Enzyme design. Structure first.
Site, PDB file in Angstrom:
ATOM      1  N   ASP A 298      77.166 -64.534 -76.084  1.00  0.00           N
ATOM      2  CA  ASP A 298      76.571 -65.612 -76.860  1.00  0.00           C
ATOM      3  C   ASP A 298      75.556 -66.368 -76.015  1.00  0.00           C
ATOM      4  O   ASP A 298      75.774 -66.617 -74.828  1.00  0.00           O
ATOM      5  CB  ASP A 298      77.651 -66.566 -77.362  1.00  0.00           C
ATOM      6  CG  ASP A 298      78.489 -65.966 -78.475  1.00  0.00           C
ATOM      7  OD1 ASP A 298      77.970 -65.823 -79.601  1.00  0.00           O
ATOM      8  OD2 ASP A 298      79.669 -65.643 -78.227  1.00  0.00           O
ATOM      9  N   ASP A 554      84.465 -67.601 -76.997  1.00  0.00           N
ATOM     10  CA  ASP A 554      84.681 -69.027 -76.775  1.00  0.00           C
ATOM     11  C   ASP A 554      85.126 -69.601 -78.108  1.00  0.00           C
ATOM     12  O   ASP A 554      84.390 -69.508 -79.095  1.00  0.00           O
ATOM     13  CB  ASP A 554      83.395 -69.700 -76.267  1.00  0.00           C
ATOM     14  CG  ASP A 554      83.503 -71.223 -76.153  1.00  0.00           C
ATOM     15  OD1 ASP A 554      84.403 -71.850 -76.749  1.00  0.00           O
ATOM     16  OD2 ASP A 554      82.658 -71.805 -75.440  1.00  0.00           O
ATOM     17  N   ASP A 558      86.124 -66.229 -82.488  1.00  0.00           N
ATOM     18  CA  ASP A 558      85.860 -64.894 -81.971  1.00  0.00           C
ATOM     19  C   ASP A 558      87.075 -64.268 -81.297  1.00  0.00           C
ATOM     20  O   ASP A 558      86.917 -63.374 -80.463  1.00  0.00           O
ATOM     21  CB  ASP A 558      84.678 -64.934 -81.004  1.00  0.00           C
ATOM     22  CG  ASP A 558      84.751 -66.101 -80.044  1.00  0.00           C
ATOM     23  OD1 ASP A 558      83.691 -66.678 -79.726  1.00  0.00           O
ATOM     24  OD2 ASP A 558      85.868 -66.440 -79.605  1.00  0.00           O
TER      25      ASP A 558
HETATM   26 MG   LIG Z   1      77.423 -70.115 -79.546  1.00  0.00          MG
END
Ligand SMILES: [Mg+2]
Ligand SMILES: Nc1ncnc2c1ncn2[C@@H]1O[C@H](COP(=O)(O)OP(=O)(O)O)[C@@H](O)[C@H]1O
Ligand SMILES: [K+]
Length: 829
Positions: A298, A554, A558
């Protein structure tokens, strides 16, 4: 056990005798059954049945029979050396297991799911197991439920993330009084728990490779023993000589402590990684991290910092001159202990004179919809002194317009300017936020965009540059629009192939042929506007093509993607559930830490692979030398010398776990056919060298062949075997030529000491009847160095788009098409 196994009213309803906030006097609780019941504390610190456990087994029984059949305790020459070898193996195994079990627990301690309970004061938090049963609990937005039990009377629904202990993967929304399951996450909610069954009814890969390797080595030893026994039967050898031969070959052939030293290498590497702020959940995650080829990270928090810079809010709008700041800050949770990165920048940049002091007063919040990833939009309903219900909305700039398309529907004067400005700020690398306001019941003005900016970390660009030399391919995942993601890719040198996740086909496809949506996902520099489900779909797709994917997770959203990924990486600031579902938990931010951990894991895997090749190569070497020499010539090395050869192979190996091993420049994996080929070839080369050494003394007499002045066959063979065997480690622990990297002082010293001991053995011959000339040992050293050089040269020489045929593309197309038609039919016209 529910009622008679530690549960009744006094641990259930006497909990709810005080208010929500308060707890005192854990009194005489009479039982602390909390610490993973009878799992870690089971037979606590026995510390003496592990020692005797290494003295019992198949090989240890052979050694015991050897030490007994040496006329008992007649003389301390055969018995002494055999018992010394057995004791050394047992002690080395015990020490290695102790080190590996005393350091994997230190990583478990620094990763325990600490549990919060609020008492009269601002109690920090309670360390995980030592919490009394029948006590309050505060599960807060992605925390592993520390203790089983039921909800507290306060009214709120928490969506517990299940399928870890149950079946359904959807929202398991227990509301009030239901059974809250321990070791489970909460997707969203704010509730309190009453503890019931605090420890009751709670409902790698290198090891398998080692097991297979050990089985094949056992097969080889059995084949050698069969040759020896057959050849002794044809010669009518007495049973004692046959037993001596089989003892020597059993000692050399089966590696006593291969899995133990492999686990020790893994544990030392994991400790070194945790020193680098990278704690490993399961010891098998080292190999998985070493093997990853694609790292899907990410953008926010890994490729860029979480603090945002605000640059001149776009207050060019209609009647609303400056309401952007006021209405945007109106949607602030203002907790300052659980607020995200977005919320902080609004408060830090509230240096506004006219009304910033008066805007935070009396604006009492009525409804506050949290930021939903599927919506990219936070909606809040608050009160005002004027009495109106100002329903603030803040999110992606396009989504706010999609919200305000009903009232004042898309005027060409403002919509074109809005899209042009958001595109311009995308070109300027600015994250933008749109705000719309609701004064009355039929008013919807568009306020404008807020140009926030989070610069990449100062080490990110060079980290991404070096990650391309490591064989990785970084795939960014942004919830932003495509333009911002593409500009970030240009800034980071990440390449600009960014596809919108929904448009591409992750989930409900856009009639894109299935064989090519997989191809686009595989060859994609990023994915913009990504929802939580798209992360799992990306991981699932990337594994079909044959990759090992590492996901940067995080938060609780996810968690399934972290579980599905080959190496789920929980990045800095992750929630409890995210790090519980991950494989590696990081305590340092940025991609630099991830890449450093990758390099370290590759080094650890190189140590493991080098040792394995060493062990099985010298096993093959010495078995196909001694067995062949027994079969052909009814002769074998003196039993003391062969025992010392085995010992020297357990001294130059307790140091392989501590050395400056280089890391591969490409992802490293168990290529078992290539490993076996390399090791068999190395063992054959070593055996040919030893056979040349002994056939020289057959050719030119005991003291005339490789020896010049005088010597004896057995000690000369001892020296040659010891030198050429121990020096083998210097060529396995290298990338290409053995002179590339300098070995650590520990390994070099431990090997040079063994070489000195073998040379002294040969010079003074203190296990046979004659000594060897000082020039004979020189010639043996020269010949062993030549064998080492040719063996290292052999090791160095042999050291080194749509990814599908018609079958593969057809299969992927069929998979995606069947998914789409299943959805289509399920719609049922
Ligand atoms: Mg993010
Ligand atoms: N707390 C928030 N309030 C409003 N908009 C937000 C908030 N957090 C993120 N956004 C917007 O949502 C989009 C991306 O959100 P996200 O999916 O959170 O990015 P990341 O996943 O990289 O954190 C961007 O337009 C961003 O400005
Ligand atoms: K996994």
């Amino acid at each position: 056990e529910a009622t008679p196994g530690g549960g009744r009213v006094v641990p259930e309803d006497m909990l709810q005798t005080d208010t929500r906030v308060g707890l005192t006097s854990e009194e005489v609780v009479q039982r602390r059954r909390k610490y993973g019941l009878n799992q870690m504390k089971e037979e606590k610190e026995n510390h003496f049945l592990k020692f005797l456990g290494f003295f019992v087994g198949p090989i240890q029984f052979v050694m015991e029979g050897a030490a007994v059949l040496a006329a008992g305790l007649e003389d301390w020459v055969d018995f002494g050396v055999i018992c010394g070898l057995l004791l050394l193996n047992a002690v080395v195994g015990f020490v290695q297991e102790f080190q590996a079990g005393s350091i994997v627990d230190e990583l478990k301690k620094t990763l325990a799911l600490k549990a919060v309970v609020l008492r009269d004061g601002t109690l920090k938090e309670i360390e995980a197991p030592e919490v009394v049963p029948g006590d309050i609990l505060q599960v807060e937005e992605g925390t592993i439920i520390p203790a089983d039990g039921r909800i507290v009377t306060d009214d709120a629904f928490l969506q517990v993330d299940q399928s870890a202990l149950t079946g359904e993967s959807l929202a398991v929304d227990k509301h009030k009084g239901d059974q809250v399951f321990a070791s489970s996450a909460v997707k969203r909610g704010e509730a309190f728990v009453v503890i019931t069954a605090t420890g009751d009814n709670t409902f790698g890969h290198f090891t398998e490779v080692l097991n297979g390797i050990g089985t094949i080595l056992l097969i080889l030893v059995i084949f050698t023993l069969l040759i020896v026994w057959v050849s002794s039967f044809y010669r009518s050898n007495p049973i004692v000589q046959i037993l001596e031969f089989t003892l020597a070959i059993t000692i050399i052939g089966v590696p006593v402590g291969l899995p133990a030293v492999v686990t020790t290498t893994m544990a030392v590497g994991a400790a070194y990684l945790a020193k680098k702020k990278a704690i490993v959940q399961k010891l098998s995650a080292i190999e998985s991290l070493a093997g990853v080829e694609i790292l899907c990270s990410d953008k926010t928090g890994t490729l860029t910092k979480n603090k945002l810079s605000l640059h001149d809010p776009y207050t060019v709008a209609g009647v609303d001159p400056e309401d952007l700041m006021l209405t945007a800050c109106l949607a602030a949770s203002r907790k300052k202990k659980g607020i995200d990165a977005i919320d902080k920048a609004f408060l830090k940049s509230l240096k506004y004179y006219p009304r910033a002091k008066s805007v935070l007063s009396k604006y009492k919040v009525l409804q506050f919809h949290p930021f939903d990833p599927v919506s990219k939009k936070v909606v809040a309903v608050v009160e005002s002194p004027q009495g109106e219900r100002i329903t603030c909305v803040k999110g992606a700039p396009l989504f706010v317009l999609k919200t305000v398309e009903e009232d004042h529907p898309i005027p060409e004067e403002v919509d074109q300017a809005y899209k042009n400005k958001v595109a311009e700020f995308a070109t300027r690398g600015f994250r933008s936020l749109g705000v719309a306001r609701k004064r009355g019941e039929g008013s919807w003005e568009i306020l404008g965009i807020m140009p926030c900016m989070d610069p990449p970390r100062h080490d990110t660009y060079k980290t991404v540059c070096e990650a391309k030399t490591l064989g990785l391919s970084i795939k960014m995942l942004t919830g932003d629009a495509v333009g911002i993601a593409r500009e970030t890719s240009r800034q980071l040198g990440l390449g600009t192939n960014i596809y919108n996740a929904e448009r591409l086909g992750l989930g409900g496809g856009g009639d894109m042929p299935g064989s090519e949506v997989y191809d686009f996902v595989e060859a994609a520099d990023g994915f913009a506007e990504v929802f939580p489900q798209h992360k799992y779909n990306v991981v699932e797709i990337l594994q079909q093509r044959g990759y090992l994917v590492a996901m940067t997770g995080d938060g609780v959203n996810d968690a399934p993607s972290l579980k599905k990924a080959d190496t789920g990486i929980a990045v800095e600031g992750s929630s409890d559930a995210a790090r519980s579902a991950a494989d590696i938990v990081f305590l340092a931010p940025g991609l630099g830490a991830i890449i450093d951990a990758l390099k370290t894991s590759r080094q650890i895997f190189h140590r493991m692979y080098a040792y394995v090749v060493y062990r099985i190569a010298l096993s093959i070497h010495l078995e196909i030398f001694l067995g062949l020499w027994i079969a052909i010539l009814n002769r074998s090395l003196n039993i003391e010398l062969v025992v010392f050869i085995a010992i020297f192979a357990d001294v130059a190996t307790l140091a392989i776990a501590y050395d400056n091993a280089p890391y591969s420049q490409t992802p490293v994996k168990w290529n078992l056919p290539k490993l076996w080929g390399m090791s068999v070839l190395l063992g054959v080369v070593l055996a040919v060298g030893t056979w040349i050494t002994v056939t020289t003394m057959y050719a030119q007499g005991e003291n005339g062949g490789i020896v010049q002045n005088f010597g004896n066959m057995d000690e000369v063979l001892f020296l040659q075997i010891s030198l050429t065997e121990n020096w083998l480690i210097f060529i396995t622990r290298a990338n290409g030529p053995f002179w590339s990297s300098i070995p650590s002082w520990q390994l070099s010293g431990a090997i040079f000491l063994v070489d000195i001991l073998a040379t002294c053995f040969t010079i003074w011959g203190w296990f046979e009847h004659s000594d060897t000339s000082i020039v004979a040992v020189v010639r043996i050293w020269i010949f062993s160095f030549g064998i080492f050089c040719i063996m290292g040269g052999v090791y160095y020489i042999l050291q080194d788009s749509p990814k599908g045929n018609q079958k593969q593309r057809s299969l992927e197309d069929f998979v995606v098409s069947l998914q789409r038609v299943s959805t289509q039919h399920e719609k049922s016209q």
